[PDB]
Design an enzyme around this catalytic site. Structure first.
Site, PDB file in Angstrom:
ATOM      1  N   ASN A 118      44.346   6.607  -0.529  1.00 32.20           N
ATOM      2  CA  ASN A 118      44.054   7.729  -1.409  1.00 32.20           C
ATOM      3  C   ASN A 118      42.639   8.288  -1.265  1.00 32.20           C
ATOM      4  O   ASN A 118      42.451   9.501  -1.234  1.00 32.20           O
ATOM      5  CB  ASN A 118      44.326   7.347  -2.869  1.00 32.20           C
ATOM      6  CG  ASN A 118      44.235   8.535  -3.811  1.00 32.20           C
ATOM      7  OD1 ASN A 118      43.150   8.946  -4.202  1.00 32.20           O
ATOM      8  ND2 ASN A 118      45.377   9.104  -4.158  1.00 32.20           N
ATOM      9  N   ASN A 173      41.925   3.692  -6.853  1.00 32.21           N
ATOM     10  CA  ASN A 173      41.789   5.122  -6.622  1.00 32.21           C
ATOM     11  C   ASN A 173      40.418   5.546  -6.097  1.00 32.21           C
ATOM     12  O   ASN A 173      40.181   5.527  -4.893  1.00 32.21           O
ATOM     13  CB  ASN A 173      42.118   5.832  -7.941  1.00 32.21           C
ATOM     14  CG  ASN A 173      42.630   7.225  -7.741  1.00 32.21           C
ATOM     15  OD1 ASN A 173      42.179   7.938  -6.847  1.00 32.21           O
ATOM     16  ND2 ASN A 173      43.578   7.632  -8.581  1.00 32.21           N
ATOM     17  N   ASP A 227      39.734   8.492 -11.647  1.00 35.48           N
ATOM     18  CA  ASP A 227      40.309   9.019 -10.418  1.00 35.48           C
ATOM     19  C   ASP A 227      39.186   8.992  -9.370  1.00 35.48           C
ATOM     20  O   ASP A 227      38.711   7.914  -9.011  1.00 35.48           O
ATOM     21  CB  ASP A 227      40.845  10.441 -10.650  1.00 35.48           C
ATOM     22  CG  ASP A 227      41.953  10.831  -9.667  1.00 35.48           C
ATOM     23  OD1 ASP A 227      42.011  10.281  -8.545  1.00 35.48           O
ATOM     24  OD2 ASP A 227      42.769  11.707 -10.022  1.00 35.48           O
ATOM     25  N   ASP A 230      31.631   9.670  -7.424  1.00 34.87           N
ATOM     26  CA  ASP A 230      30.502   9.887  -6.514  1.00 34.87           C
ATOM     27  C   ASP A 230      29.181   9.634  -7.238  1.00 34.87           C
ATOM     28  O   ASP A 230      29.089   9.826  -8.443  1.00 34.87           O
ATOM     29  CB  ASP A 230      30.507  11.315  -5.945  1.00 34.87           C
ATOM     30  CG  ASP A 230      30.963  11.373  -4.492  1.00 34.87           C
ATOM     31  OD1 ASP A 230      30.600  10.482  -3.696  1.00 34.87           O
ATOM     32  OD2 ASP A 230      31.692  12.319  -4.142  1.00 34.87           O
ATOM     33  N   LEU A 271      35.507  14.739  -7.376  1.00 33.91           N
ATOM     34  CA  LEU A 271      34.285  15.542  -7.419  1.00 33.91           C
ATOM     35  C   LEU A 271      33.405  15.217  -6.214  1.00 33.91           C
ATOM     36  O   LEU A 271      33.437  14.097  -5.693  1.00 33.91           O
ATOM     37  CB  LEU A 271      33.533  15.286  -8.737  1.00 33.91           C
ATOM     38  CG  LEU A 271      33.214  13.829  -9.111  1.00 33.91           C
ATOM     39  CD1 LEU A 271      31.808  13.468  -8.662  1.00 33.91           C
ATOM     40  CD2 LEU A 271      33.341  13.630 -10.614  1.00 33.91           C
ATOM     41  N   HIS A 272      32.617  16.191  -5.777  1.00 36.53           N
ATOM     42  CA  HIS A 272      31.742  15.998  -4.626  1.00 36.53           C
ATOM     43  C   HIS A 272      30.577  16.974  -4.697  1.00 36.53           C
ATOM     44  O   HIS A 272      30.759  18.135  -5.052  1.00 36.53           O
ATOM     45  CB  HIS A 272      32.529  16.243  -3.342  1.00 36.53           C
ATOM     46  CG  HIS A 272      31.881  15.682  -2.118  1.00 36.53           C
ATOM     47  ND1 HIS A 272      31.959  14.347  -1.783  1.00 36.53           N
ATOM     48  CD2 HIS A 272      31.177  16.279  -1.127  1.00 36.53           C
ATOM     49  CE1 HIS A 272      31.338  14.147  -0.634  1.00 36.53           C
ATOM     50  NE2 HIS A 272      30.855  15.303  -0.215  1.00 36.53           N
ATOM     51  N   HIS A 285      44.074  18.730 -11.400  1.00 34.96           N
ATOM     52  CA  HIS A 285      45.528  18.856 -11.338  1.00 34.96           C
ATOM     53  C   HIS A 285      46.229  19.695 -12.391  1.00 34.96           C
ATOM     54  O   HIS A 285      47.418  19.979 -12.238  1.00 34.96           O
ATOM     55  CB  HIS A 285      46.173  17.473 -11.317  1.00 34.96           C
ATOM     56  CG  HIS A 285      45.892  16.695 -10.073  1.00 34.96           C
ATOM     57  ND1 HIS A 285      46.363  15.418  -9.874  1.00 34.96           N
ATOM     58  CD2 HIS A 285      45.207  17.022  -8.953  1.00 34.96           C
ATOM     59  CE1 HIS A 285      45.986  14.991  -8.683  1.00 34.96           C
ATOM     60  NE2 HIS A 285      45.282  15.948  -8.103  1.00 34.96           N
TER      61      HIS A 285
END
Ligand SMILES: [Ca+2]
Length: 312
Positions: A118, A173, A227, A230, A271-272, A285
């Site tokens: 994932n 995850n 989920d 970072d 997130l990034h 989602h």
């Protein structure tokens, strides 16, 4: 727990199961649409997003022997501008900017069938830590560890070994690597979605983790939990809490969140950070979209941003 409500600006839309936000070495932005289907069968995609217009471009629609992929998470490589993509049906893939891809492994270092992955996280040494909440990769029947503990953790090393480092997780995850100030990798954080837990391990070396510990607790009793995640430049861990309408912010020591970030949606997936900025791109989602907001500081330097041949 103090909560902040920064402005979330829409980036792009209509991306089924939008997640895996990542920036490459040229600053280009990509995301994955794991839930795109063709006649009820998996036909997941990897897309490039034009940040100036929001226009989408499907660069890769992975399939192996007729089995469509479910691309779920990404990390950009350093030594070459290529993406390592965790796929829930195909395992680990390496995807080029031209859209071509290669399957990394059908079996691990022990000859055991690979599991659908994932998300993944590169440490500064170049080792890739991966979460595998799905069961065996295609052609095996699609299964996922949401109710039963069969999710695993892997470490794809610099010398090309796909090593399973732990098992028996209930949907491992999000995953992140904590480094010392001198860049030495020393702690691995893994999200276990339904149990509302964040687990930690001491990284003793490449594919060597010890002392599994319940590092952090995710708020809520809703269906979902941690989920994607970072680190920011100060080592605070931001985690998408799917189903809670919040992104949790943990301090360097874990435990309970020291801050929460209210999202204008219920299901943040991952997130990034955009390199060299305070901008965090968030996939979600509920509306199958991508947004961006400004965090209090810059993101932690990604492995792809570091220099192999530098002096310092
Ligand atoms: Ca990320």
């Amino acid at each position: 727990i103090p909560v902040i409500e920064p402005l979330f600006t829409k980036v792009t839309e209509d991306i089924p199961g939008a997640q895996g936000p990542v920036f490459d070495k040229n600053g280009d932005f990509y995301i994955v649409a794991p839930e795109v289907e063709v006649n009820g069968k998996p036909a997941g995609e990897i897309l490039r997003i034009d940040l100036k217009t929001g226009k989408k471009t499907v660069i890769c629609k992975p399939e192996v022997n007729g089995y469509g992929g479910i691309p779920a998470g990404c990390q950009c490589d350093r030594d070459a501008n290529q993406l390592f993509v965790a796929d829930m049906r195909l395992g680990l893939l390496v995807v080029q900017t031209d859209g071509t891809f290669e399957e990394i492994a059908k079996k691990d270092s022990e000859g055991r069938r690979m599991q659908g992955c994932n998300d993944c996280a590169f440490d500064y040494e170049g080792n890739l830590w991966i979460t595998a909440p799905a069961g065996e990769v295609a052609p095996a029947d699609y299964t996922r560890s949401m109710q039963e503990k069969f999710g695993s953790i892997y470490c794809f090393t610099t010398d090309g070994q796909m090593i399973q480092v732990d098992t028996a997780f209930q949907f491992p995850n999000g995953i992140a690597v904590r480094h010392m100030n001198d860049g030495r990798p020393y702690q691995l954080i893994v999200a276990e979605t339904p149990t509302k837990k964040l687990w930690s391990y001491d990284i003793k070396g490449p594919a060597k983790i010890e002392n599994k510990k319940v590092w952090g607790h995710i708020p809520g009793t809703h269906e979902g939990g941690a989920d994607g995640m970072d680190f920011d430049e100060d080592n605070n861990l931001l985690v998408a809490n799917w189903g809670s309408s919040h992104i949790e912010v943990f301090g360097p020591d874990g435990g309970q969140p020291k801050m929460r970030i209210r999202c204008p949606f219920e299901k943040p997936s991952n997130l990034h950070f955009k390199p060299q900025t305070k901008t965090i791109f968030v996939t979600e989602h509920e509306n199958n979209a991508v947004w961006k907001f400004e965090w209090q500081r810059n993101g932690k330097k990604q492995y792809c941003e570091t220099l192999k041949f530098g002096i310092f």
